[PDB]
Amino acid sequence: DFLPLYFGWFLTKKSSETLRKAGQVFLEELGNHKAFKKELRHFISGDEKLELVSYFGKRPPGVLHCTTKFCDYGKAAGAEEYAQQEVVKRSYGKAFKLSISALFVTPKTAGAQVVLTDQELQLWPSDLDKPSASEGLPPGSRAHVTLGCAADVQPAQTGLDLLDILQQVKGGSQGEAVGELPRGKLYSLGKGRWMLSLTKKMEVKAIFTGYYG
Ligand SMILES: Nc1ncnc2c1ncn2[C@@H]1O[C@H](COP(=O)(O)O)[C@@H](O)[C@H]1OP(=O)(O)O
């Protein structure tokens, strides 16, 4: 039995649509915000204003998801080990609620930050080789829903972008709200990194299962 392309929490139609809409609204608001317009030179090398919805042109089609373990049908290291865990097998097909704490944007990716519960964290892989960007941060910090990518950006970048943002927030808690959007306060972590910290945690319903391409 070969494995999925990856395991993860696949948002329901309703949840996906709601989160997708919130993301689109955020990109729109952020692109119209003066704090962002002034900092456009740290975001692109090209010279007006930038519609971020077109900037993040590569978007997931259909239902949004929060990936746990990328398996590539068993070719990814640790894939077999992850899939054979009892909690994975037991949780397969089960419904969960994911807590979205923030939306974020970088020159590469737009996404939503997922804060996993302890129960859900048991489904988070503990692999042998880690990205060093996760050092000193709690397990599962990388948890995210990808909303969009710049044209030449590759997958798994959104997870990396998020960790880079979070290891800015831990060291400095960096920003007083440069703006106050209606869903929360807006942070500018420099270098084209933006974060909307939601006053209000968004809850999305999802199913833990495997995607097979
Ligand atoms: N090396 C990888 N490591 C972790 N996740 C990956 C990797 N490659 C692809 N993915 C993740 O699997 C999902 C589908 O990827 P793909 O479209 O290439 O098949 C995406 O959520 C992507 O994460 P991400 O959302 O951060 O890009």
Residue numbers in the entry: 163 to 209, 213 to 378
What does the report in the manuscript say about this coordinate set?
2′,3′-cyclic nucleotide 3′-phosphodiesterase (CNPase) comprises 4% of total myelin protein in the central nervous system (CNS), being the most abundant CNS non-compact myelin protein4. CNPase consists of an N-terminal polynucleotide kinase-like domain10, a catalytic phosphodiesterase domain11, and a membrane-anchored C-terminal tail, which contains a cysteine residue that undergoes isoprenylation. The catalytic domain enables the rapid hydrolysis of nucleoside 2′,3′-cyclic phosphates to nucleoside 2′-phosphates. The CNPase catalytic site, lying in a groove between two lobes, has pseudo two-fold symmetry and contains two apposing His-X-Thr-X (X denotes a hydrophobic residue) motifs, characteristic for 2H phosphoesterases 113537.
While we have also obtained structures with an open β5-α7 loop from other mutants and the wild-type protein in complex with products, this has been particularly easy with V321A. This could relate to a higher binding affinity for the product, which would result in enzyme inhibition via hindered product release, and may explain the increased KM value. To further investigate the relevance of ligand size, we crystallized V321A in the presence of adenosine 2′,5′-bisphosphate (2′,5′-ADP), which, in addition to the 2′-phosphate, also contains a 5′-phosphate, thus mimicking the first 5′-phosphate of an RNA molecule. Similarly to V321A in complex with 2′-AMP34, the 2′,5′-ADP complexes show the β5-α7 loop the in the open conformation, with direct interactions between the 2´-phosphate and the N terminus of helix α7. The 5′-phosphate is visible and extends out of the active site towards bulk solvent. In an RNA oligonucleotide, the 5′-phosphate will be followed by another ribose and a base; several aromatic residues on the CNPase surface are in position to interact with these groups.
